[PDB]
Structure formats: structure tokens, C-alpha cells
Write a new protein. Structure first.
Lengths: 154, 62, 212
RNA sequence: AAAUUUAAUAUAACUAUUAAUAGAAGGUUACUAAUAAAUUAAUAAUUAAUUUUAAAACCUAAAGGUAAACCUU
RNA sequence: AAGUAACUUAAGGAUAAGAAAUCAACAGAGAUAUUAUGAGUAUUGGUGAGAGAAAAUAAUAAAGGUCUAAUAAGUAUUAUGUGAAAAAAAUGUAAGAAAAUAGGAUAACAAAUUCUAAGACUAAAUACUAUUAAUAAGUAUAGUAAGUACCGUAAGGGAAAGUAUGAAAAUGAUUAUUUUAUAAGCAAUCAUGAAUAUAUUAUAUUAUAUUAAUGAUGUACCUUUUGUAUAAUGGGUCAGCAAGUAAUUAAUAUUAGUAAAACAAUAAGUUAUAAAUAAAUAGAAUAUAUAUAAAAAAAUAUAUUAAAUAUUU
RNA sequence: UCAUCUGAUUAAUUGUGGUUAGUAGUGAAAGACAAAUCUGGUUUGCAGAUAGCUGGUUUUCUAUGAAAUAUAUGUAAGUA
RNA sequence: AGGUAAAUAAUCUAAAGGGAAACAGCCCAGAUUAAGAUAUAAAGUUCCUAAUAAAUAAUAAGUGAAAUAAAUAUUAAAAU
RNA sequence: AUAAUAAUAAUAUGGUAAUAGAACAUUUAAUGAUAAUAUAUAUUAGUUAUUAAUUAAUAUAUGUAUUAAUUAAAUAGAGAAUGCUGACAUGAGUAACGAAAAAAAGGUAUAAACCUUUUCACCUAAAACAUAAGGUUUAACUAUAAAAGUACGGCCCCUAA
RNA sequence: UAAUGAACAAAUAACACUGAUUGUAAAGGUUAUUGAUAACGAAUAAAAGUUACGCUAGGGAAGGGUAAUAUAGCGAA
RNA sequence: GCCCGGGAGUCCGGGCACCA
């Protein structure tokens, strides 16, 4: 017997212990990442679960209706509206992802009752996982454009 | 991090894939031996395959 | 993941049938089998490092130049990725901008004649030097080569003076050569150096000094 | 229309990271070693913030000693 | 190993460092602190084990500059003994300067550059603690008890232990079925009667299960060995725990992305794009032409390389 | 422990307190003792010292499958 | 010398199966899993124990019958 | 011009050290239907060329899977360390129960062992009576060990080492 | 067919190869040569004993074989 | 190798480097 710290004995240490902050971070070429992002988006579009929202920037064929805007934004009434929307679109239980050009605080507030199934993400911080995870994605037109620019090709 | 074995570096030098080195045996005790024979002991020489692995490990950045 | 990307790693000491059972690829009972012995240990015979004489020295004054072949330039021209009517001289900076010479440039560029037989561009070229053959080729083409001197800092300035401008609203002027060898090189006619092709003041000054 | 589940939260865990903020009583046994306000905001009681205020034995190198919780001034 | 452990002393919320007698190279920069690159490069070592910068470019950072010295000798310097494996700045002992018309900085000298010692202050990035908030392919033997019980004269060491549930095993008693008092050996396997049990298709001359009639076959397992039934090692049985992991690099492979470029794209930088030489101002059209090295007037000769209506490696 | 044996006014025995010990004391000297035993204690730390040595290294299935020779070795239990 | 040192070949090492009573190294034969009809290897065929019948000689000692003990002596038998 | 499965012919399939290839169990993370007629675990009997899973019956949970599957990872698999911890065996109901003198009657149709009486014994310059030190207060105990001091100690005064 | 010795560190010459701010130098390198490690692939410039007071890790890195000798017996004399 | 002590030479004894 040696000291009582040998992993051979019940009270002792662990052999080949893992220690404090374990670093699991890995690399990926930026281009590859961009491609992956693009691919994800494409997949979503193919599914038909990509929905784009916008107005101010492009000429509209049909005129934007009253009582509803193109900002991706909303007891507080907003929550009720959100609920109604959900009911309409048959996507109550399923997880959804709002990709937003800026911090639409109101929207987030409205959604937070359904926080478990709702991601609300700022443009720059959207992840491939988040898109893939989401059963239906709602994105601003401007945000979409930005994303495209980012993960271009050249 | 890992580092070159400096002795090895001093002795050996990288030429394409392999390494070159000075022939051993010429420093002294040369007289009486034929100068045509000692011509062979001058000049560089290329690393034998046997020891290439070792060389590689020794000098990982060459 | 893509087929062929990943393998299972070999799990040692995990039962006999796995293949790497008890001894776990080590064999029996050696120093190797438990303790560490340096991979390149030779058994005590004088090692490959210790046997041979140590040779040469590293010239720290040396400045290795990036080589650039006429052939590459020609290829670029053919492609149409070479825009030189705006800037009539193709200097090192210009080359780097183009892509022509890629990666970092520490000391300078030497032009080399690889595709001299197929080179035909009536262009003004500037670099740290060029092989005789290359020079000849250039002259045949009806082109004009001159070989300039750049110190590290000077070279850096040349490559992107924009940065310098951004920093301190100025570009540092070009240093004269000071090392005798360098001076000699630039004087030489055959090397096509910028001291005699431009008729520099420095040379004149030197001459004056010699006289008096 | 109340219950059930799911996820989060305590005065009630530690460990690592990241971000913010700041740089603080133990014992012993007993003649047990306690509190009192005011002002301001919120709404007479109120909670909070800002304050002043009473008590608090003995021991824990240097009133001076000793064999810590004792003795001597 | 290592100026690490340890001991000792002293201060503070932080401390240290800090506005060049610094770096550099004749072009320049402009305090410190420490992270990427530079770079495992220069430097160095019984030239072994091994050790290893700086400039420069980037980040992090804060307003980062600013006088508090009547501007500094037993000081600089020298000799000598010590002194961060590479780069000095320090220091014991004695000798001992100079006024910006002057000093320091490099084996040495000559030029030239640059800074001004012997006077000073300095936030921020940082270290450690404590609290709060968040995130956990973290912990219920890293989940609050206890520094208690107990052990030691002492320094010191140091347990168990949440609540439910529990047909887990080892282990004990008992009952049932079956075998067993003329039989001898890893206690199993295969053959093979008989007895018992269960079975909602046993229709039976049935099927499974249990069971040491009887026969044949059968030197435990591991370790270590030329070789083990060995009378060589190890294990009383069961349950739980007990061993190829991580960081920073290098080389090969496979697949993916991009591709004469790749990664990063603030600028750098890394690898590739040209081989060779100790090094130097040298360097590419079938080879018999050419490049580099030794040689030389130039070839030859040796080695390695490049080079074949087209679209570069 | 029992028996037997030796000293038993002394270089005697013994109580109470104190001093000297870990490169290290004490020692009519045996390397004897320094808290059940020391050619130099114990505890904490350096610390996961080092070990060419011993032991151990946990599922299965497939394919291939050796060596114990030479050379060198402060080397012959190792390693190239 | 079941010794020691090398040479050649095999086997064992790392090889189970049949034989050699038992057997690392001998004699045959290389087990992917079964099945069990036909060839068989080495070894065997009174029983134990899977399988046998013949021919010609010799032996009378239990010689011998899967591990041959020598010089020599005696007795016989052939040949010259 | 592929894959999956099935044929036909052929060759190959012992294996230590070792190399190569392919799977399964366990646990965690990402995605994720479903349902008490469901699930999880266990026992028994089946099934599939079977370390695994599944079927049926049975028992216990549980308003119910980090469930199927694909990835990512691992404190990822144990008869082998004179391993470690816990539990339980074996020797075994064996050795021993530690210097030894007990008896009766009664407490008490409860006593070899507690108490009382009597008898007998043992120690007696002690196994007695006073004390010092020491210590889980062990005592004749909580209703508890009483001091102005003189063959009473401390503190106190005074010093030794 | 033997007549020999690595690297490292020193030393002497030649080379014109680099010359750490430039120029010189110093220093290094290239070429040629020098002296030994005989335990002769050379651990360091430099190294002997004892332990029955010893300790740790390990390994075994009278029996069995043989019958030279011994005893005993035979054949020949 | 260099310098001594007993013009050149021999024969002897001291040192001084070399000692990787
Ligand atoms: Mg194996
Ligand atoms: Mg071995
Ligand atoms: Mg082993
Ligand atoms: Mg081995
Ligand atoms: Mg007192
Ligand atoms: Mg300070
Ligand atoms: Mg200061
Ligand atoms: Mg260091
Ligand atoms: Mg100053
Ligand atoms: Mg005790
Ligand atoms: Mg055997
Ligand atoms: Mg045993
Ligand atoms: Mg005493
Ligand atoms: Mg003695
Ligand atoms: Mg004594
Ligand atoms: Mg095979
Ligand atoms: Mg060894
Ligand atoms: Mg033998
Ligand atoms: Mg073996
Ligand atoms: Mg066999
Ligand atoms: Mg074989
Ligand atoms: Mg076979
Ligand atoms: Mg017989
Ligand atoms: Mg016989
Ligand atoms: Mg096989
Ligand atoms: Mg494990
Ligand atoms: Mg187990
Ligand atoms: Mg097993
Ligand atoms: Mg075990
Ligand atoms: Mg018995
Ligand atoms: Mg008995
Ligand atoms: Mg008894
Ligand atoms: Mg008794
Ligand atoms: Mg009675
Ligand atoms: Mg008396
Ligand atoms: Mg008494
Ligand atoms: Mg030697
Ligand atoms: Mg030797
Ligand atoms: Mg020696
Ligand atoms: Mg013997
Ligand atoms: Mg014998």
C-alpha cells in the first residue's frame, strides 16, 4: 500500500482525472460553415417551412393590409394575437424560430408564454442547429438578405 | 510545445524529402592513407531510410 | 458524416476478444511495456546525431527572396487578371495586389526565367532582382526591368502605404543601401540595378568622396 | 371550473466557466450575554431605504501573571 | 529539478511594473502589464540532458501623462569575486571620472544613430478571495452532517451515516421432487433408462423442465515460462469500486471545404508555388537541352532537379 | 510465571519537577537508547520521487500473423 | 549427461484431432459450423477396446508379447 | 458500371506476441412519435445462427421512456493487482472463558453467578486501615462528597532546578 | 588478405564564404592537417574499498540426469 | 612538439605546452 489516494481503493482519487475547465472547442473552415448554413436554409425552403416577412425595401404587388405590419413584431393583447396566429397556422405544439433584424422586444414578450417551443434570435447570432431544430422558421427579408450576403460564395 | 533537437539540426540539413550530413571519419589521422581513398570520406551524404523516421521525430519543423 | 471520414479509435485493455486485451499492444515485460524510453534512444551506441560532424552555419544576414517566374506572369496576362495600363510599372506591391505573388513578402521578390521562350509582354517590371536569362527575355519582349533595393520597413511601406497613411498621415521615405555588398549589387550594370539605371545621387556622392 | 404533469425559482449544496459587484469571529459556562427610536418613500398599523441608540459575562502572545475560559491588581 | 518546495519578513485591496541614460538601423518607433503571430527562429549547452529571446504586426486596456527634483558622485566606470541554461541589472572587496564644448548604449576602434543614470507620482487590462446572475453531454462514494467518532504523548491522521423501496448475490435453516449406504478422482459434456412436475391442440405410442441408475469422454482458471495437473504465481465467496486519459506541438493516412493557391482575413503570419549550396551578388527550351553544388576558359564527368493549336504545377 | 541464582550503605534504589534529540541528543560503548526497538524517530510537504523490476489492464465476431537470429550497447532482465 | 556450444530440417513456442498406456518437442494430421454416407493417414484388429482371416518357416525360454544388457561360456544347426 | 438478397464454380477461414476490419451492452447530449390494452425491472418457458433482442405468463413499480433511429461523446464492459470497501462464510459450535474453596437456609413453589444469616476457607509488614498520582463519578448518588486554624493540604509569602 | 579510433572541444595553415547599425575586426564556416578514448561504437576533464548492523525491488534468468571416480561382479590368466 | 641542466653530434635528467 502507498498513500490512500490511489484509484485502486474506494476512497481514493480517480485515474486519469479530467480537471477544471475542459475545452471541447473545435475548428471548421469559415467557407464550409457558410455552405452548411446555406444548405440548412435551402432544406428549410424545400420543406416549405421557411416564411419570409417584409415590405419596406421592395415594391409590393398586393398592398400591405391594415392592422398588420412587416416588422416581425407585436394581459397585453400582443400575447393574445400571437396565440390566435398559432391557432390559425396549426403550429401550436411545434417549435419555431424567429430570425429578427433587431431586438423586437414586444415580440419576445408576446412569445415568452410559449418559450419552450419558441426561439427568437438576432440575425447575427442565428445558428445552423437552431434552423435545423426549428419546425417552422420566420425571418425578416432584410435579415435574410444579410445572411445571404454573409454566406455568399466568393 | 515540441522542439527541434538542436544537435541533430546542427549535424543534419533538409534537402527536399531527405536529410543530408557530413561524412564522419575525416577529422584527423589522415596521413599515410591514399588521398584518392579519402576523397570518398569528403562531401555530404544522404540519410539512410532505416533512420529517416528518427530524424523526422528529432526535427519536426524541418 | 461523409463516408470515409471517421474510424473507431482503438480501445486498449478491454477484454481479450477485442484484440488489444491484457497487454494492450505492448507485448511482454520490457521497459517499453511500462516505463517511457525515448523513441529515438539508440541503446547506448553513439546516436545518429552524435556520430556525424556538425556542418555549416546559418547566415542571419541572409534575406531569402520569394521567387516569381516569367511564366506565371505570362499565364496571368493570358487569363486577364493583370491590369497594368493604370500603373505602367509592375512593382512588388502591384504583384501582391494582383495575386501574382501571394503569401507574405519579407525581404523581396526575385524574378526568374521559367517560361522565357513563351514570354512576350512589353512591360516595366520592378523587383528585388532577376536572373540574367529572365532579364534577357524581358529585353527581347521589348520590356524594361530594373532591380530596386528595399529594407524590410521600406518594403513594407511599398507593399501597402495605405496602412502607413492611416497610421501617421505619411509614408516613410526609402532608405539608401548601406551594406557595401548591397551597394555594389545595385551599382552593377548587368544586374540592372536602380543605382545606375536611375543614376542615383548616392553613387555620385561616393565617387566624390573617393576623389577627395 | 378544480385538479395532474412538465420547465423555472427559496433562507436550503458544492464544483467549473463567463459577466457584474465588493474587498471579510470563534470558543467556555452561566448571577443566560436583551434593545429602543427618528426621518423619508410606499399605503393609523404597514414593509423598505436612510439613520441615531441600549445591552454584550469569561477565554482566545504583549494592565501582570497562569496549567485557555482562572488568579492578581 | 529550480530560484520550484519549504521556512522567514513586510505591505495592499490588489501588489509589482511604468513615461526611455528603451528599442532600432541611417528608414523609423515611441510608458508599462500579457496574450496571437514572429518562433521552437536567432542565441546557447559535459555544444549531452536540454534551455531559448528581441524587433515587428495584432488584440486586451485607460484621459494616459505628469512634475513632486534648487536635476543628482564615493555615483558612472575599472579591477577582482559572485550573478535569471539564451538576452543583464544587480552585488561583496578596493581603485575612481566628466558638464550638454558633457555622459550612457555595441569584444575593440573609426564613423553615424539614438537616449540622458545616480530625484519622483501614476488609474485600466492582471492575481486571489467573497457575493449575485447566467451556462452545465459536472458531482448524490466532488451532494451540505465532521474536522466529529476514533487513532497518536504530540505535531498529525481521520470514518460511517439522507428518505423510501428492495424475488441482487454470497450465507443459514426448512420443505418438496429426485438420486444416493459394494462405491474412488476438476464434479462437467455427450450417450442413456427410470422417477417426478407443468402444459386450455397430451389426438399419443405427446412435448418440455428437474433429477450424480448406468456407460463413454474429461489433469480447474489466471500469471510467467523452453515448458505447468503441477508439489511454480495469485485468488475464502459474493456485491460495489479499480487501469491507455488531457493539454501544447510534429509527421503520416482517410474524407470533406476551397484550390495555383489554402487558412485567417484588422494587419500581420503559416504552408504551398523552385531545385541546390556550409554560405555567398547564382537559379529551369526528351535530353544528348537547362538549373544548382564541387571543378572550370567552356564543356565532360557525379548528384538531384525542372522541361513534351493549348488551358500552368 | 514459577522455581533457582546475584547485589542488597552504595559507582545503591526510588518519587516529584527540570535540561539535552533528529547531521542528531544521551551513551561505565551494546551501533545501546531518543514513546513496543533507530548503522539515526515520527509527522507534514516536495510527491503521482524514481524503478531497464513484480503484478495487474474489463464485451464479442472476423482477416492476416511472428521471434527468441546478426550487429551495437557500463551491455547481457533493457534498447536501437 | 534431460550437459554445453554452434550447423541443417521439422515440430513445439502459438496447434486442437488420431496414435505412441499416461506424453510440449516422436509418428500421422492443421479445428469456419454442422452432419456422419464414402475414401482413408499414422497406428491397430482374443477381451479390456473401434476392427482379422490366411500361408511358410523358427522358437519351449513365458524367450518374447511399444523402452533389445556386454564381453564371454555351454549346447545344438548349417556350410566347407 | 450501384446496392440489397439468392444461386453456380473455385480458393481461403488453428493461433500466443502483434497488425487490420466490423459489431453489441452500459451512461450522458442533440433531434423525437407514442401509452395503465402502456412501460420499466425481475423469474420461468419459448423465438431469431442468440455477449443481444424479442414473444407469452407471472410479480412489483410508474400517469409514464433522453424510448426507436442517426449523430456526438464517454468515470463505456472485470475471476485475476499477497487490489481496495462492505457483507457473509470456513476452521466451529472447536480452543478458551485469565493464578482460586466452597456449602446450606431464607430473600424468591424466580437464582451455581444478586442480597442476608450461619458454616468452611483465603490474605494478613496484606487481598486490611489510612493516603499521593491517575481516571468514562466508578461511591453507601441527584434529598450527593460540609473547614478561620492548632500531629489540614492547597492560594499566599519565599525561593531551587 | 592485418598495420587501427566517431563525434565534441582545442590548435595550425589555406578559402573569400558570412561579417548582428555601417566600415574594419572578432567570431563562425568551407577545404587540408594535428594529438585519444586498447573496456578499442569512445557515459565525465576528473573516481577505490567494506558491511556477519544492513535495507528495497526482483530472480532463482538435498532431489532429477550422468557414472569420470567409488563399490560390486564377471571373462581371460 | 618548445624551453633548460648535465659551433656541432650523441647519451642522460628536469620542466613547459597537448591532455579532445
Ligand atoms: Mg492478441
Ligand atoms: Mg522477456
Ligand atoms: Mg505482465
Ligand atoms: Mg518488449
Ligand atoms: Mg502558582
Ligand atoms: Mg504601485
Ligand atoms: Mg513606482
Ligand atoms: Mg528555465
Ligand atoms: Mg530621468
Ligand atoms: Mg488513545
Ligand atoms: Mg501437461
Ligand atoms: Mg493462496
Ligand atoms: Mg527523574
Ligand atoms: Mg558491531
Ligand atoms: Mg548503555
Ligand atoms: Mg492464418
Ligand atoms: Mg536490464
Ligand atoms: Mg539443452
Ligand atoms: Mg513465449
Ligand atoms: Mg498436438
Ligand atoms: Mg507451424
Ligand atoms: Mg484449418
Ligand atoms: Mg516376458
Ligand atoms: Mg521390454
Ligand atoms: Mg483466424
Ligand atoms: Mg471503468
Ligand atoms: Mg465484480
Ligand atoms: Mg470473464
Ligand atoms: Mg480482485
Ligand atoms: Mg477440531
Ligand atoms: Mg477437543
Ligand atoms: Mg475445553
Ligand atoms: Mg476467573
Ligand atoms: Mg435460593
Ligand atoms: Mg505480626
Ligand atoms: Mg482503602
Ligand atoms: Mg571510457
Ligand atoms: Mg564502453
Ligand atoms: Mg572510471
Ligand atoms: Mg544437487
Ligand atoms: Mg540422483
Amino acid at each position: 500500500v502507498g498513500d490512500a489516494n490511489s484509484p485502486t481503493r474506494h476512497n481514493g482519487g480517480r485515474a486519469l482525472a479530467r480537471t477544471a475547465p475542459n475545452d471541447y472547442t473545435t475548428e471548421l473552415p469559415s467557407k464550409v460553415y457558410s455552405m452548411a448554413f446555406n444548405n440548412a436554409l435551402s432544406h428549410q425552403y424545400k420543406s416549405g417551412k421557411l416564411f419570409v416577412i417584409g415590405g419596406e425595401k421592395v415594391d409590393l404587388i398586393s398592398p400591405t393590409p391594415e392592422l398588420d405590419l412587416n416588422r416581425l413584431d407585436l394581459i397585453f393583447e400582443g400575447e393574445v394575437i400571437f396565440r390566435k396566429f398559432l391557432e390559425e397556422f396549426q403550429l401550436k405544439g411545434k417549435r419555431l424560430l424567429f430570425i429578427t433584424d433587431k431586438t423586437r422586444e414586444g415580440l419576445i414578450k408576446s412569445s415568452d408564454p410559449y418559450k419552450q417551443k419558441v426561439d427568437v434570435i438576432q440575425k447575427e447570432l442565428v445558428e445552423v442547429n437552431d434552423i435545423l431544430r426549428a419546425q417552422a422558421v420566420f425571418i425578416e427579408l432584410e435579415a435574410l438578405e444579410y445572411l445571404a450576403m454573409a454566406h455568399q460564395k466568393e | 510545445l515540441m522542439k527541434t533537437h538542436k544537435g541533430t539540426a546542427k549535424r543534419w540539413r533538409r534537402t527536399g524529402n531527405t536529410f543530408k550530413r557530413g561524412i564522419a571519419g575525416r577529422k584527423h589521422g589522415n596521413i599515410g592513407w591514399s588521398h584518392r581513398s579519402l576523397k570518398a570520406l569528403t562531401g555530404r551524404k544522404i540519410a539512410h531510410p532505416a533512420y529517416s523516421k528518427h530524424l523526422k521525430r528529432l526535427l519536426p519543423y524541418h | 458524416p461523409s463516408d470515409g471520414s471517421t474510424k473507431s479509435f482503438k480501445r486498449l485493455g478491454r477484454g481479450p476478444s477485442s484484440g488489444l486485451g491484457k497487454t494492450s499492444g505492448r507485448g511482454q515485460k520490457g521497459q517499453k511495456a511500462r516505463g517511457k524510453v525515448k523513441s529515438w534512444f539508440e541503446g547506448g551506441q553513439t546516436p545518429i546525431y552524435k556520430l556525424f560532424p556538425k556542418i555549416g552555419f546559418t547566415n542571419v544576414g541572409a534575406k531569402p527572396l520569394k521567387e516569381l517566374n516569367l511564366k506565371r506572369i505570362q499565364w496571368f496576362h493570358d487569363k486577364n487578371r493583370l491590369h497594368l495600363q493604370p500603373g505602367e510599372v509592375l512593382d512588388m506591391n502591384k504583384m501582391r495586389k494582383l495575386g501574382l505573388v501571394t503569401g507574405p513578402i519579407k525581404y523581396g521578390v526575385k524574378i526568374l526565367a521559367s517560361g522565357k521562350f513563351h514570354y512576350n509582354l512589353p512591360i516595366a517590371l520592378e523587383a528585388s532582382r532577376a536572373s540574367a536569362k529572365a532579364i534577357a527575355a524581358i529585353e527581347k519582349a521589348g520590356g524594361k526591368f530594373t532591380a530596386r533595393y528595399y529594407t524590410p520597413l521600406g518594403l513594407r511601406a511599398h507593399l501597402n502605404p495605405q496602412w502607413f497613411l492611416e497610421k501617421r498621415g505619411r509614408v516613410p521615405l526609402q532608405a539608401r543601401p548601406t551594406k557595401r555588398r548591397d551597394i555594389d549589387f545595385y551599382s552593377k550594370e548587368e544586374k540592372r540595378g536602380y543605382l545606375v539605371m536611375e543614376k542615383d545621387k548616392l553613387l555620385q556622392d561616393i565617387k566624390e568622396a573617393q576623389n577627395k
